[PDB]
Design an enzyme around this catalytic site. Sequence first.
Site, PDB file in Angstrom:
ATOM      1  N   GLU A   1       0.847  -1.213   0.000  1.00  0.00           N
ATOM      2  CA  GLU A   1       0.000   0.000   0.000  1.00  0.00           C
ATOM      3  C   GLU A   1       0.870   1.245   0.000  1.00  0.00           C
ATOM      4  O   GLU A   1       1.901   1.317   0.676  1.00  0.00           O
ATOM      5  CB  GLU A   1      -0.879  -0.035   1.252  1.00  0.00           C
ATOM      6  CG  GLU A   1      -1.909  -1.141   1.135  1.00  0.00           C
ATOM      7  CD  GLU A   1      -2.486  -1.559   2.460  1.00  0.00           C
ATOM      8  OE1 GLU A   1      -1.863  -1.413   3.508  1.00  0.00           O
ATOM      9  OE2 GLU A   1      -3.647  -2.065   2.395  1.00  0.00           O
TER      10      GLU A   1
ATOM     11  N   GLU B   1     -10.995  -4.365  -2.059  1.00  0.00           N
ATOM     12  CA  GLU B   1     -10.697  -5.618  -1.404  1.00  0.00           C
ATOM     13  C   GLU B   1     -11.322  -5.619  -0.036  1.00  0.00           C
ATOM     14  O   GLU B   1     -11.708  -4.564   0.481  1.00  0.00           O
ATOM     15  CB  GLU B   1      -9.167  -5.796  -1.145  1.00  0.00           C
ATOM     16  CG  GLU B   1      -8.306  -5.534  -2.333  1.00  0.00           C
ATOM     17  CD  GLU B   1      -6.831  -5.599  -2.060  1.00  0.00           C
ATOM     18  OE1 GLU B   1      -6.398  -5.601  -0.861  1.00  0.00           O
ATOM     19  OE2 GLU B   1      -6.066  -5.677  -3.029  1.00  0.00           O
TER      20      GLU B   1
HETATM   21  O1  LIG Z   1      -2.134  -2.306   5.913  1.00  0.00           O
HETATM   22  C1  LIG Z   1      -2.697  -3.531   6.317  1.00  0.00           C
HETATM   23  C2  LIG Z   1      -4.185  -3.379   6.565  1.00  0.00           C
HETATM   24  O2  LIG Z   1      -4.245  -2.429   7.664  1.00  0.00           O
HETATM   25  C3  LIG Z   1      -5.595  -2.165   8.045  1.00  0.00           C
HETATM   26  O3  LIG Z   1      -6.179  -3.334   8.585  1.00  0.00           O
HETATM   27  C4  LIG Z   1      -6.563  -3.276   9.943  1.00  0.00           C
HETATM   28  C5  LIG Z   1      -7.930  -3.955  10.053  1.00  0.00           C
HETATM   29  O4  LIG Z   1      -8.824  -3.138   9.281  1.00  0.00           O
HETATM   30  C6  LIG Z   1      -8.395  -3.957  11.502  1.00  0.00           C
HETATM   31  O5  LIG Z   1      -9.669  -4.564  11.652  1.00  0.00           O
HETATM   32  C7  LIG Z   1      -7.361  -4.648  12.377  1.00  0.00           C
HETATM   33  O6  LIG Z   1      -7.226  -5.984  12.028  1.00  0.00           O
HETATM   34  O7  LIG Z   1      -6.082  -4.018  12.156  1.00  0.00           O
HETATM   35  C8  LIG Z   1      -5.575  -4.028  10.839  1.00  0.00           C
HETATM   36  C9  LIG Z   1      -4.213  -3.334  10.831  1.00  0.00           C
HETATM   37  O8  LIG Z   1      -3.258  -4.131  11.447  1.00  0.00           O
HETATM   38  C10 LIG Z   1      -6.456  -1.707   6.864  1.00  0.00           C
HETATM   39  O9  LIG Z   1      -7.819  -1.610   7.210  1.00  0.00           O
HETATM   40  C11 LIG Z   1      -6.301  -2.543   5.599  1.00  0.00           C
HETATM   41  O10 LIG Z   1      -6.844  -1.739   4.592  1.00  0.00           O
HETATM   42  C12 LIG Z   1      -4.846  -2.769   5.312  1.00  0.00           C
HETATM   43  O11 LIG Z   1      -4.755  -3.609   4.163  1.00  0.00           O
HETATM   44  O1  LIG Z   2      -1.562 -10.373  -1.344  1.00  0.00           O
HETATM   45  C1  LIG Z   2      -1.767  -8.938  -1.331  1.00  0.00           C
HETATM   46  C2  LIG Z   2      -1.314  -8.294  -0.044  1.00  0.00           C
HETATM   47  O2  LIG Z   2      -2.048  -8.878   1.049  1.00  0.00           O
HETATM   48  C3  LIG Z   2      -1.741  -8.313   2.332  1.00  0.00           C
HETATM   49  O3  LIG Z   2      -1.939  -6.965   2.503  1.00  0.00           O
HETATM   50  C4  LIG Z   2      -3.318  -6.637   2.444  1.00  0.00           C
HETATM   51  C5  LIG Z   2      -3.897  -6.541   3.866  1.00  0.00           C
HETATM   52  O4  LIG Z   2      -3.789  -7.788   4.653  1.00  0.00           O
HETATM   53  C6  LIG Z   2      -5.382  -6.442   3.592  1.00  0.00           C
HETATM   54  O5  LIG Z   2      -5.967  -5.524   4.486  1.00  0.00           O
HETATM   55  C7  LIG Z   2      -5.658  -5.989   2.171  1.00  0.00           C
HETATM   56  O6  LIG Z   2      -6.828  -6.415   1.547  1.00  0.00           O
HETATM   57  O7  LIG Z   2      -4.808  -4.973   1.871  1.00  0.00           O
HETATM   58  C8  LIG Z   2      -3.373  -5.231   1.784  1.00  0.00           C
HETATM   59  C9  LIG Z   2      -3.067  -5.125   0.329  1.00  0.00           C
HETATM   60  O8  LIG Z   2      -3.753  -6.064  -0.565  1.00  0.00           O
HETATM   61  C10 LIG Z   2      -0.268  -8.540   2.672  1.00  0.00           C
HETATM   62  O9  LIG Z   2       0.003  -7.980   3.934  1.00  0.00           O
HETATM   63  C11 LIG Z   2       0.550  -7.870   1.587  1.00  0.00           C
HETATM   64  O10 LIG Z   2       1.956  -8.107   1.859  1.00  0.00           O
HETATM   65  C12 LIG Z   2       0.199  -8.454   0.221  1.00  0.00           C
HETATM   66  O11 LIG Z   2       0.937  -7.767  -0.786  1.00  0.00           O
END
Ligand SMILES: OC[C@H]1O[C@H](O[C@H]2[C@H](O)[C@@H](O)[C@@H](O)O[C@@H]2CO)[C@H](O)[C@@H](O)[C@@H]1O
Ligand SMILES: OC[C@H]1O[C@H](O[C@H]2[C@H](O)[C@@H](O)[C@@H](O)O[C@@H]2CO)[C@H](O)[C@@H](O)[C@@H]1O
EC number: 3.2.1.2
Length: 516
Positions: free
Chosen positions: A172, A367
Amino acid sequence: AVNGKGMNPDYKAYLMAPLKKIPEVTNWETFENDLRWAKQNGFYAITVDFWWGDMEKNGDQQFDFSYAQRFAQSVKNAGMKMIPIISTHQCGGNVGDDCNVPIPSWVWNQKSDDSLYFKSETGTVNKETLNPLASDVIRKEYGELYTAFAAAMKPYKDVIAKIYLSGGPAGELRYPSYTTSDGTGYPSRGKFQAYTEFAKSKFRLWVLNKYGSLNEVNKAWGTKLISELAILPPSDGEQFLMNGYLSMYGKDYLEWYQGILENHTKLIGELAHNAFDTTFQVPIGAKIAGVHWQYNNPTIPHGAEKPAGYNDYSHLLDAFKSAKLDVTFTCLEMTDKGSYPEYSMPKTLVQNIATLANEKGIVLNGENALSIGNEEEYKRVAEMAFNYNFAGFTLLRYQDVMYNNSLMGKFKDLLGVTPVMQTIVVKNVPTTIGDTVYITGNRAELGSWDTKQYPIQLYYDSHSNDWRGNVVLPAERNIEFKAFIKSKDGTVKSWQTIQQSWNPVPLKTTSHTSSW
Ligand SMILES: OC[C@H]1O[C@H](O[C@H]2[C@H](O)[C@@H](O)[C@@H](O)O[C@@H]2CO)[C@H](O)[C@@H](O)[C@@H]1O
Ligand SMILES: OC[C@H]1O[C@H](O[C@H]2[C@H](O)[C@@H](O)[C@@H](O)O[C@@H]2CO)[C@H](O)[C@@H](O)[C@@H]1O
Ligand SMILES: OC[C@H]1O[C@H](O[C@H]2[C@H](O)[C@@H](O)[C@@H](O)O[C@@H]2CO)[C@H](O)[C@@H](O)[C@@H]1O
Ligand SMILES: OC[C@H]1O[C@H](O[C@H]2[C@H](O)[C@@H](O)[C@@H](O)O[C@@H]2CO)[C@H](O)[C@@H](O)[C@@H]1O
Ligand SMILES: OC[C@H]1O[C@H](O[C@H]2[C@H](O)[C@@H](O)[C@@H](O)O[C@@H]2CO)[C@H](O)[C@@H](O)[C@@H]1O
Ligand SMILES: OC[C@H]1O[C@H](O[C@H]2[C@H](O)[C@@H](O)[C@H](O)O[C@@H]2CO)[C@H](O)[C@@H](O)[C@@H]1O
Ligand SMILES: OC[C@H]1O[C@@H](O)[C@H](O)[C@@H](O)[C@@H]1O
Ligand SMILES: [Ca+2]
């Protein structure tokens, strides 16, 4: 959908691959069978991290693309498509990760200063991804990696549907402001990530470029800084987020801090288009996190987003448009809460990002942030995807549906859909001057009966004296719907007497005609 539209006719569903290599999960022949099953359930393509730590591990320009080549040949064998992610960030350490792939260790030796990594307000070093301040090193290393990946993967052009770039941690475009080691994990406030000596020098030089001299900096900020070395990022991040952000200093620091991400978007988009457009001719995207916690904290407003680099989403999205990168927002499945202590507003945030992206003409993909175990979260995703004009939805992650047939069938029903235009015609409608006509219906693609925000507009046909609309609908799904009238002032006047249905919406375009 919003604005009297329907669902995006370009909508596709995608499945994320595992974070580990396929043979750590299942053999290549079973994987091909899995891809055929995903395809049958409405997935158009598999997204897949190709880790920098795997592809340039042993030293500069020592490449190994053999895993990506083997993967692509199994995608081809399965009659599927794939979306490579050129994952220049670390696998391991972010939510849901089950992997351990740092970026190549030799990269850290390319500089003897601290330009390549991040340091937080309290000194925590982060080496998950290269610091986007180091634009010389990023230009060299990402340009070389993107060019070599394109040459190695040219034989597989036919199965590559899109390519994703990694703008920062977890793939991201953001700073690593929420991490366990820094005490900033969800749901805490974030810490700013600009405390290397290099980041301090870059902000200082940016400020002195803007204003010319320290005397003009002090006039602009209303400060009494004695020397240029007192131009610094915030010494008290919590106070900055409480009230320092409002000052001229605060607007300048946030402009600079977010601006590093905007310039990085420009750079990686230039590098990617140059490396990929002639070979592949596909869309190129990047991702923004949904930093939904501390959104409405009254004491530290947006206290996790600002340290992540997200101060002004309109300006951030403009950088994607300029760079010709499509945007993916990665947290679609959640509900607003807004309550102490997490102050979490994820649905408001994706509605705002989607509205801005649609305004700006940026192709928008989504996503889910966390693995989904229940159909209710798919319904939530569908609400967002199909009412806010998403062109794609990617499901995190592979095994959650591959090894859960019940949940896979719920995904196929709700989200694995193929859009098809159908003409809806409603006869004998008792409209008066100023009235407009809409449809609404049961599925998310029809706005789930919400007449206020989500209904689909029809148009009078003065040749036939009826109301008609070419509406994009989910092929081969059952629907119920009705026409209704809004008065000039926007209030709902009346409804078609009898509930209409299509069991199912036909695969091929035709028409549905009914009377009021
Ligand atoms: O950058 C990773 C992920 O971070 C955030 O995810 C949150 C999640 O939404 C919470 O419910 C909880 O699990 O903490 C996570 C961060 O550690 C973002 O919402 C997500 O977009 C992003 O991919
Ligand atoms: O495989 C794509 C991506 O998945 C994870 O990061 C996610 C995060 O867990 C989710 O919140 C999500 O839907 O957003 C991020 C970007 O897709 C892995 O942590 C990341 O390393 C990986 O590239
Ligand atoms: O301009 C005076 C003063 O402003 C800032 O001080 C902050 C401080 O960082 C916070 O900890 C808290 O005390 O609020 C102050 C603002 O009233 C600067 O950081 C500081 O250098 C400066 O002297
Ligand atoms: O670079 C000047 C000054 O910036 C910071 O102080 C800010 C503070 O962070 C803001 O929250 C608000 O109070 O304005 C201050 C500037 O007037 C640094 O903390 C400080 O060390 C630095 O000199
Ligand atoms: O609100 C959900 C409800 O919406 C529609 O019901 C309309 C009904 O068709 C109208 O004749 C009038 O009674 O207002 C209702 C909404 O307040 C759907 O027909 C119905 O199936 C759905 O549950
Ligand atoms: O008759 C039901 C479905 O059976 C098979 O689908 C398999 C799929 O091949 C496999 O990858 C997945 O793990 O399990 C499902 C169910 O056993 C056929 O391939 C499908 O066409 C059938 O619909
Ligand atoms: O089910 C398909 C048919 O459904 C009816 O409700 C409509 O009146 C027809 O126009 C349509 O072809
Ligand atoms: Ca290199």
